Amino acid sequence: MISDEQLNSLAITFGIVMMTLIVIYHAVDSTMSPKNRLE
């Protein structure tokens, strides 16, 4: 239902934001404590 501009914008937004959260959470979690299960 949304337009192309809205879709693309939301895509890059969720993508970037999510990436940062993953890097921040993983970085802090990894630095704070070790990895319970190898990757």
Closest CA to 39 of 24, 19, 30: 30
For residue 10, what are the contacts with CB-CB under 8 A and spacing of at least 6?
2
Q: What is the DSSP letter of 35?
A: -
Which alpha helices (H) appear in the chain, and where do they start and end? 4-32
Length of the chain in residues, anyone?
Answer: 39
- Contacts of 1-10 with CB under 8 Å at 24 or more apart are none
Look at the block and give the residue holding tokens 């501009």: 5
Closest CA to 39 of 22, 15, 17, 20: 22
Q: How was this structure determined?
A: NMR
| Domain boundaries, given as residue ranges, for the chain | 1-29
Query: What burial letters (b/e) apply to 10-33, b meaning 16+ CB within 10 Å?
Result: eeeeeeeeeeeeeeeeeeeeeeee
What gap in Å lies between CA 7 and CA 38, rounded to an integer? 36
What gap in Å lies between CA 38 and CA 30, rounded to an integer? 12
